[PDB]
Design a protein around this nucleic acid. Structure first.
Ligand SMILES: [Zn+2]
Lengths: 207, 84, 125, 48, 149, 50, 118
RNA sequence: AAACUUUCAACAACGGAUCUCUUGGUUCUCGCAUCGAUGAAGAACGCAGCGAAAUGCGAUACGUAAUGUGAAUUGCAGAAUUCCGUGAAUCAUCGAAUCUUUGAACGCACAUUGCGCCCCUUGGUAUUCCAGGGGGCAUGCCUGUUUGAGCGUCAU
RNA sequence: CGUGGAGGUCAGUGACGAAGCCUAGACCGUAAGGUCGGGUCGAACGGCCUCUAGUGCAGAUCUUGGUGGUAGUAGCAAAUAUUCAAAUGAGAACUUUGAAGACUGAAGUGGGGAAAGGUUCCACGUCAACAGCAGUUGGACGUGGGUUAGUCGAUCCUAAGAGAUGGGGAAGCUCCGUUUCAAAGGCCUGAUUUUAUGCAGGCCACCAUCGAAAGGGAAUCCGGUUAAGAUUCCGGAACCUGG
RNA sequence: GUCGAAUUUGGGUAUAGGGGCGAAAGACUAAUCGAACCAUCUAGUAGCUGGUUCCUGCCGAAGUUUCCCUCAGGAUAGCAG
RNA sequence: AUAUUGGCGAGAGACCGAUAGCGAACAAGUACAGUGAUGGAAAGAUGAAAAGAACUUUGAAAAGAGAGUGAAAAAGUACGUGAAAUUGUUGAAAGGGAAGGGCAUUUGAUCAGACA
RNA sequence: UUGACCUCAAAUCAGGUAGGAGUACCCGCUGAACUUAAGCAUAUCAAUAAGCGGAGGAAAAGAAACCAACCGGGAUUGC
């Protein structure tokens, strides 16, 4: 608050007295009358360069650079040395640009979907997630950031019919559409590689 | 002496209680309170006294009536019998 | 997770709204499940708690002890059970403050306006 | 007697009540003692 | 001060300029608001579009001379030639300008066709208390777009 | 003073009825932060300026 | 301890007679309270008086309402308490007034409804 | 040589740092438009079975009526099945009322709990005196009613 | 190297004890610093790749808080002066009573009051704090009681003065002025009860209001009484005003 | 020193800040006066004093030219990275 | 369409985390000072549950020591952990008008490592 | 004599209204200096703060005695 520290009438006393020259409250009948003020050093005083609201919170990036990076991150999915470095448990996967049938876009329940992701070999990443739920360190967990998981597979579709609602609840799993692919889902923490599960009707739409 | 003696001759007030703010501010040789000109219709307030405009302004007191208007607007200023 | 704009995921608001909660919200916050026979008999899982109900403890140092409720102290968020008391060192007794979540109902103090409650929930007679 | 406290508890309450009233006095004196003797217009009766 | 080989630059921050800063964090929220307003208007006028029919006019300068654009509204002569009335026109989704005089025929014959097409292309319902409802299309400045000659 | 007004007397009466301790049963409540009465006043220390 | 659902029935005189005895009850309780620490009956009496007086006034108010019924000016206590502005403002009739020109225009060229399709 | 002084450790003290916590702030965003002469905001005083406060409230005084909920309040005492009910409760809701003395503050005045006037009514032997109860008495301005003024002016 | 927070990761440590803290106990690093053991303690915290800052103190007559040496030191020395015995009590230079001695010495260390203070008055109980020693005492602490007016005073009048109205100024908050350049008002007979007025039947030309507990002013005394009130109460004896 | 008067004094009342009042000293104006007090503009400006927080490594100066109401300061070339 | 550090209701944060963040996390525009305008603070945490130390004994009494509650009084309302300055007791050591430090070693104390 | 008109008044006449609070935003008046200019007086700070008046949920503005000099546009507001 801009008026922090300046909610106070305070002017120095000066030389002569055996005190400093910092501004000093005036009056009497309390402990503040005489105390320092109007300062970065002073208790009850302001800060140095109060954090202002105007400040580059958000940052421009050029469209083709965003697209370059997104294509690179899509490509790194297909490389299992990076997928596995990044964290994902894919050692028992058949093949890495993991494609399944487009009948996955149409299942509605969650018991029916996790049964599929266990079948095509993602069971270990889901386990990895729900075994990693630890508590946050520090003063974030009373800023609505209590918990931390590890991230999981990314299911990619072409036309949502219930799949997104289904996998809304499983931990770690994210969903996306081939159009409106997100770099924050493909390269989290700037770490290339992400175990993606494509549908054939998405994989075709990519070209 | 301008001090410790002349604090001894201090036994007649230049101030007493205002009937509109209830504090010792009513100058009596002239009849005007120094925190809200009482005979005056307007309450004393200046935009350099932004602290003073917290010690007296709305929300300070009971708000006997004004506490209920947001309750009454929400219901649409309805009237009559409560219900069955 | 959540989907609405009207409900908060905020710790602070959700805690204030518990500790400053009135004695009408503290009726349904102090709810307690039913024993399996009663879930069968009345087709419910849980109900709010009322004096003169008969109960069982499934979690705590005083597990397994039954009792009837002596008083619902819905300012401490607690219930006080008969036959569940510590002999204070002088020889007096004091009942232990429970929490209803840690309980299970064995027998129900019925009444009109609980029979109705059950029938709206989808229960039985 | 009816409203809770009996005589020995009145005594034991008064004592601690007084004590917590005196603790704050010790604190107020400490926290005022520095800038109580701070005179705005002390004349310093000395030039020669 | 003046120090080195650097441009002279004028920067107008001698006034109490911090009292007056408008940082548009709203830019994502009031877009949503604008969309929602468009949407509820679309239901409060349920078959009608949100916008009116506007004409094409030469943009005025030596610079924008070659570029036509949507203007404010049609003129009384253009309407009269379109077999219409300046007061029924506004009831249907047509704009009208009483100030714009037209001295060019290439534009007259254009903003007349825009009104011949419109009446042929719309469906006007009778005036009553249960008037029928068919459909809702929103951009008459996109189904009757403005192409250059 | 002795030849006083009524406004003054009424305020003095209030200040009298305020010049009591804290009732001990206050301290036994279930969520209590009140240990003593801090708005206490006696004619030696603090004068009430009326 | 009494209840207004059984006091609406009674008459103004019965209610006054039911009041000037509650007052004696309260009088004697304020004496017994001096020879006894706690008299909690003196609350239920003090609220009972009010349960009577509310009823009295809500009987003497309806009688005036259905006296000034069908009259252009009724008292201010019985009139609405909306806000000052919503009483100083216009009525739905005064605001729905239009020149003959405007209404002639409106029944001639009203805002039609239409849609853009072949 | 001990005392003494100094250094280090253990335990104890003074003191309240660090670590963890947080019904609090701060900032951003979305929605709404709602004070007052029908007496506001604000102030003084008073009110609970035992409270000085804070919160609530006004001689109907931590509250009444009404509506919903459907058995508590709980610090103590008191109540208690009215508890298969016109019904607990510092509950919630709130559309009926109360709303002391004041305050733009409105009978005059107010460093006063000061002084009046009109109407109705009661009592005292009382249209006149005293007292009690109830209701009114401000200013500016508008529309209208009533009365009145001015050789301003007309007709007779 | 290090600190607060953010995104990824170790399917990281942990109530079989996280963090923090003490440790002339250990290891590594040139070093910033990191790691380990022990004791204490009780709930969250880290390594790595990166992001980001309110990011690192010996200092500023720095800010706040706290604590020392000097120091059991200077020093508690004006106001003529205290002493004996007893009672009380855990305890008496200091309380109570008694005896003695002495002071103020009637322009007082007496008896009342105005301002001002506000319950300090009186009693019962009491000693942690206050009474710069003590304390069984107290203007302290706790609980309670207590201030009675036709005659005292305020109230009423006006002084110096303050201040509305009408009016005039001023952008305006507000200013001038106080009877001014205002249509500024009640009060009485007939009319005898319609009491509304025909006349009456005329009366200055006034015209706010505030302002003195010491000025002006309607009227009171004795005795008695209480833990603490009294020209107020009780008893007796009187007076003034309005009816 | 003066002590019956240009005396002392309570209360009421008037005068309020570039204004008051002044037997006049630049004295008094709430311990404040060669221009009171309070808050705000105000984080007033300062070529001037003081301080400016972790390690190691590599390189490493200047106090001289020209102009400036310039001489406790800047620009400029140089030195240096 | 636009404005909105005010009011009413909602949602959130790469924000502060009790000397910070609003002056106010608490009976804060509170206490308190000043004639007055105005100025203006400090102060959060026992524990899961008061089970808040029955009882015995010394004492004039506070309090103490035993007991006891507790998972833990190394949590006893002066209560989370409980740093430092500063201080007491114990133990070791030294010490002619300062102390402390650097190089090197003796003596003492402690640690080391088994290379079984 | 009477009834009209005009003008001006009075009334505790009937019915009404305005005053004050708040004030972040809004509409107008009024109106500074510190400061910058390495001095300072024009200037700037600033058509700002302070002071005053007045409204709302938005206000104000607004459907041209406009822009322009085009092959001419077409209320206002805002980006
Ligand atoms: Zn006042």
């Amino acid at each position: 608050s801009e008026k922090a520290g300046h909610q106070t009438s305070a002017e120095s006393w000066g030389t002569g007295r055996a005190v400093a020259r910092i501004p000093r409250v005036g009056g009497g009948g309390t402990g503040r009358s005489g105390q320092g003020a109007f300062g970065n050093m002073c208790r009850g005083g302001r800060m140095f360069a109060p954090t202002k609201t105007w400040r580059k919170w958000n940052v421009k990036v050029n469209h083709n650079e965003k697209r370059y990076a997104t294509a690179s991150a899509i490509a790194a999915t297909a490389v299992a040395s990076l997928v596995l470095a990044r964290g994902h448990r894919v050692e028992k996967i058949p093949e890495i640009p993991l494609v399944v049938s487009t009948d996955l876009e149409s299942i509605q329940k969650t018991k029916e979907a996790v049964a599929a992701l266990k079948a095509v070999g993602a069971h270990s990443d889901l386990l990895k997630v729900l075994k990693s739920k630890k508590l946050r360190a520090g003063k974030g967990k009373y800023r609505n950031r209590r918990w931390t998981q590890r991230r999981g597979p990314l299911v990619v579709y072409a036309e949502d019919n219930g799949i997104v609602k289904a996998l809304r609840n499983v931990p770690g799993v994210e969903t996306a559409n081939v159009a409106s692919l997100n770099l924050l889902q493909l390269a989290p923490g700037a770490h290339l590689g992400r175990f993606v599960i494509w549908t054939e009707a998405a994989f075709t739409k990519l070209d | 002496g301008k001090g410790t003696p002349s604090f001894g001759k201090r036994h007649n007030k230049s101030h007493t209680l205002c009937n509109r703010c209830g504090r010792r501010s009513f100058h009596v040789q002239k009849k005007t309170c120094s925190s809200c000109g009482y005979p005056a219709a307007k309450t004393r307030s200046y935009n350099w006294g932004a602290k003073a405009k917290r010690r007296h302004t709305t929300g300070t007191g009971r708000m006997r009536y004004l506490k209920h208007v947001s309750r009454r607007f929400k219901n649409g200023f309805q009237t009559g019998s409560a219900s069955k | 997770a959540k989907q609405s704009l009207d409900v908060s995921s905020d710790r602070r608001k959700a805690r204030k709204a518990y500790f400053t909660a009135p004695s009408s919200q503290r009726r349904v916050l102090l709810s307690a499940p039913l024993s399996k026979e009663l879930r069968a008999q009345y087709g419910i899982k849980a109900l709010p708690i009322r004096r003169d109900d008969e109960v069982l403890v499934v979690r705590g140092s005083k597990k397994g002890q039954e009792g009837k409720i002596s008083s619902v102290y819905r300012l401490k968020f607690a219930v006080q059970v008969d036959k569940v008391t510590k002999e204070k060192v002088n020889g007096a007794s004091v009942p232990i403050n429970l929490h209803p979540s840690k309980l299970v109902i064995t027998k129900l103090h019925l009444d009109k306006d609980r029979k109705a409650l059950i029938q709206r929930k989808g229960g039985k007679l | 007697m009816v409203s809770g406290v009996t005589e020995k508890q009145y005594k034991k309450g008064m004592k601690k009540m007084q004590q917590l009233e005196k603790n704050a006095i010790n604190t107020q004196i400490r926290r005022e003692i520095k800038r109580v003797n701070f005179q705005t217009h002390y004349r310093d009766e000395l030039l020669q | 001060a003046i120090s080195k080989n650097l441009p002279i630059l004028k920067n107008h921050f001698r006034k109490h300029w911090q009292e007056r800063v408008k940082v548009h964090f709203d830019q994502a929220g009031k877009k949503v608001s604008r969309r929602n307003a468009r949407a509820t208007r679309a239901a409060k006028i349920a078959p009608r579009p949100l916008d009116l029919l506007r004409p094409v006019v030469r943009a005025p300068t030596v610079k924008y001379n070659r570029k036509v654009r949507a203007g404010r509204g049609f003129t009384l002569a253009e309407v009269k030639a379109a077999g219409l009335t300046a007061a029924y026109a506004r009831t249907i989704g047509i704009a009208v300008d009483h100030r714009r005089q037209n001295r060019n025929q290439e534009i007259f014959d254009a903003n007349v066709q825009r009104l011949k097409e419109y009446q042929s292309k719309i469906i006007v319902f009778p005036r009553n208390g249960k008037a029928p409802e068919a459909e809702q299309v929103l951009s008459a400045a996109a189904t009757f777009p403005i192409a250059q000659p | 003073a002795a030849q006083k007004s009524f406004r003054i007397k009424q305020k003095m009466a209030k200040a009298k009825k305020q010049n009591r301790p804290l009732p001990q049963w206050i301290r036994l409540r279930t969520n209590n932060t009140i240990r003593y009465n801090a708005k206490r006043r006696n004619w030696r220390r603090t004068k009430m300026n009326i | 301890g009494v209840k207004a659902y059984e006091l609406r029935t009674k008459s103004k005189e019965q209610l006054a007679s039911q009041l000037v005895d509650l007052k004696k009850e309260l009088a004697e309780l304020k004496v017994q309270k001096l020879s006894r620490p706690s008299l909690p009956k003196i609350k239920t009496v003090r609220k009972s008086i009010a349960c009577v007086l509310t009823v009295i006034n809500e009987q003497q108010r309806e009688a005036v309402r259905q006296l000034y019924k069908g009259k252009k000016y009724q008292p201010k206590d019985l009139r609405a308490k909306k806000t000052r502005a919503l009483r100083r403002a216009l009525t739905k009739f005064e605001a729905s007034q239009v020149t003959e020109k405007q209404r002639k225009k409106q029944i001639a060229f009203p805002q039609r409804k239409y849609a853009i399709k072949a």
